[PDB]
Structures are given as C-alpha cells and as structure tokens.
Amino acid sequence: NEPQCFYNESIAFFYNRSGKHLATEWNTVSKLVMGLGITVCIFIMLANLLVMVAIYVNRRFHFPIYYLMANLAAADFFAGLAYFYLMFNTGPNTRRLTVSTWLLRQGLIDTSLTASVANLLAIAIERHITVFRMQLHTRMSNRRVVVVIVVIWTMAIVMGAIPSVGWNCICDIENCSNMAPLYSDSYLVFWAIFNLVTFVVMVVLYAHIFGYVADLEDNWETLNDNLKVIEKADNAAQVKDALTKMRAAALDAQKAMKDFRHGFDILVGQIDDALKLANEGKVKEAQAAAEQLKTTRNAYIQKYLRNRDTMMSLLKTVVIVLGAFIICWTPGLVLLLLDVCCPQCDVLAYEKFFLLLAEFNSAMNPIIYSYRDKEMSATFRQILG
Ligand SMILES: COC(=O)c1cn(C[C@H](CC2Cc3ccccc3C2)[C@H](O)c2cc(OC)c(C)c(OC)c2)cc1CC(=O)O
Numbered sequence: 001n002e003p004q005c006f007y008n009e010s011i012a013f014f015y016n017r018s019g020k021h022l023a024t025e026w027n028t029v030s031k032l033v034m035g036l037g038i039t040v041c042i043f044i045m046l047a048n049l050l051v052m053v054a055i056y057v058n059r060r061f062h063f064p065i066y067y068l069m070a071n072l073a074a075a076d077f078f079a080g081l082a083y084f085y086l087m088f089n090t091g092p093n094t095r096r097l098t099v100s101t102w103l104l105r106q107g108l109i110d111t112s113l114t115a116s117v118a119n120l121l122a123i124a125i126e127r128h129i130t131v132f133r134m135q136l137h138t139r140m141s142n143r144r145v146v147v148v149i150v151v152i153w154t155m156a157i158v159m160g161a162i163p164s165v166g167w168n169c170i171c172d173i174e175n176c177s178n179m180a181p182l183y184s185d186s187y188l189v190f191w192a193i194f195n196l197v198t199f200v201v202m203v204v205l206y207a208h209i210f211g212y213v214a215d216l217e218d219n220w221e222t223l224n225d226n227l228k229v230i231e232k233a234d235n236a237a238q239v240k241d242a243l244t245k246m247r248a249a250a251l252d253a254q255k256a257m258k259d260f261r262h263g264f265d266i267l268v269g270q271i272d273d274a275l276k277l278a279n280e281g282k283v284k285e286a287q288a289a290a291e292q293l294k295t296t297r298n299a300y301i302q303k304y305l306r307n308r309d310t311m312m313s314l315l316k317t318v319v320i321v322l323g324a325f326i327i328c329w330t331p332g333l334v335l336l337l338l339d340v341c342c343p344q345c346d347v348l349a350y351e352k353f354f355l356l357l358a359e360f361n362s363a364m365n366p367i368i369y370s371y372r373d374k375e376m377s378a379t380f381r382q383i384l385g
Helices: 010-018 026-059 063-087 099-132 139-159 187-232 236-250 257-280 284-303 309-342 352-372 374-384
Strands: none
Touching: 010 099, 026 063, 026 139, 026 352, 026 374, 063 099, 063 139, 063 309, 063 352, 099 309, 187 236, 187 284, 187 309, 187 374, 236 257, 236 284, 236 352, 352 374
C-alpha cells in the first residue's frame, strides 16, 4: 500500500524528501518575515488602491495607457492579497497546509506575476503604437482596452492554473524541486525561461522606440545645425555640402498620421530646389530658400512639440516601472533555474531575501508615479480630504 497523493500530513512527506525546512515552533526571524510581510501587504492594498481611484476620478487620466496602469495596480492589489495568504502560512503554519491549500497560495502568486508581466507587455505594445504616430485615442480603443484587460487576466488565471491541472510532481515524487516540494522541475525551468524571455522581448520593444527617437532628434539636429551653416554668407561650394547634408537627413527621418507623413516630403522638395539654385551659381537664392525652410520647420514644431514632451515624460516613467520589475524579479527567477540545473554548486539560502525584493515592487509602482507624474501627484492630496 501507499499513502495518499492528497493527505494533510502529506506537506511533511514532500518537504522532507527535498532539501527544504519543516518547522514546529515559532522562530525569531519567522515572526519578523511575517511581521514585515503583512505590513508591506497592507501598504500595497492602500497605495495601489489610491492610484486606481485617482485614474477613475481625474478627467485627464481617461486614456488607453492610463487604464492599463490601473490594471497593473489591480494586479499588485491582487499580489497584496496573494502574499498576505502566503505570509500567514509560513514557518510553523506551513505544516498546517494541505495539498490543495499549498497549490492555492502558490497559485495566487503565479497568477499575480503573469498578471503584471502581461500588463507591462501590453503597456510596451501600447507605447510602440503611439510612437508610430503622434497619439492613439478614439472611443473604439477604450472599448478595445476592456478586451485587452480580459486577455491579461485570462492569461494570468490560466498560467496560475497550469501546475494545478496536472503539471506537478504530486504523483511524480522523484521529479520534485528543492525550492517548491509540490512543483515539478520541468515546470519551474519552463516558468523561469518564459518570464525571462518576456523581459528580453520587452527591452527590445523600448530599445526600438528609444533608438528611433534617437535617429529622429539626430536628423532634426542635422537639420537645425546645417541651417545655420547655409545662412552664413560664404561661397557656393559651402552651401552645396550643407544642403546635401540637409537632404540626406530628411530622407533618413522619412523611414518612420497623414498630416505628419506628408510633412517630410514637403521639406525634401524645399531642400532639393534650393540645391538647384546653388548649382547654378545663385548663392543668394540658396540662402533665401533656406529661410523659407526655417518658416516651414517652425510651423510643424508647434504641432508636434509641447505634445512629444508629455509623451516622453510618460514613456520614461513606464521604463522605470519596467526597470524596477526586472532588477527585483530576475534574481528570484535565476534562483529557480539554479534550483534544478545547479545541484551541490550553491545553497539556496537567499530565498526569503529575493521573495521580499519582488514583494516590495508591488508597492514601488505608486511611489514611481508620485514623483514622476505631475498631474497624478496633485490628485493624491485630494484623496486625504
Ligand atoms: C517567506 O517565504 C519564503 O521564504 C519562501 C520561499 N519560498 C520559495 C519560492 C521563492 C523563490 C523563487 C522565486 C521566484 C521569483 C521571485 C523570488 C523567488 C524566491 C516560492 O515558492 C515562489 C516560487 C515562484 O515560482 C513558481 C514564484 C514566482 C514566487 O513568487 C515570488 C515564489 C517559499 C516560501 C514560503 C514557505 O515555504 O514557507
């Protein structure tokens, strides 16, 4: 005969087989990890709730990008509830957990991660669309955001159910991991490489945005700097090379909504016709058409500038939220890889430290929006009254 793959005393037989703790009495550091854990959880459930109400009541925050930020806060709010149930069942209370309740606390944490991972992935796509135009907002996108929120939460529920739908070492006791005694090694290798490849493709998304913005500002720098060169009363040869640098920078910036798309070729024509005047010998007409180009770039600087500064201010804030997410979650996910692919090389003692490091990030997001966003910082003072 064999014991049940579903008993209450079963936490002890999974935890003893693998290189993991099983406590009976209340330790000194176990009380502080729980004490600090709940204190952080209450703050997450308050700070992320504050920013969710702030987007809901303020008129300026009724845009597809700010609705996704509220869902990211809702994912952290869910994480606050997930870590709360975890910290209440740590140390001597771990023995009290059954096979079903163990998968529940571990499942809620796996659901909360992919909820924030898919949210940041959706924000990365949202910023990748707005930058290929100026702004992306019609009422149809607001209705589409509701559908996107469903996709994010559906994928979170499914990813947090995959190990609880057969992919576990429950009745495959030989293939159990040292960190999670009820989770399979094949799942943890898959889960860690899935979340890390998502971080890499997200970095590529923003690197493609920042790289393109760099080429725009560079070609706009080449535009304004060589404009000053032409203006200077020199020889015909001095104007030709500057206008050649003017044309090449315009056609490079062309490799990018209708109003801005047509705007580039208007500038190419004014440069190419000014070049023809200079090739004839008319140095005057080449410099006269250059000031005509100055009155055209100053017109488009009113329609795109003041608006791109508000876009880049929010773009940087998003990368800080994503940056902090990678720096804290990567050591914990690398720890999962070293758990099954590195046996006897290093002890997995720093498991309480990396757990709290990822937990603090759920509280870091409203702190980031408080000092970066100018309009949101004034909405926070209104909540106290
Ligand atoms: C205070 O809790 C612990 O020290 C602890 C550490 N672990 C191990 C592990 C924690 C380590 C593995 C990991 C992964 C990401 C971030 C940190 C850590 C540490 C945890 O199961 C886990 C696995 C897990 O992967 C399925 C994920 C995503 C987690 O979210 C943070 C947490 C379990 C516990 C609770 C206990 O056994 O009483």
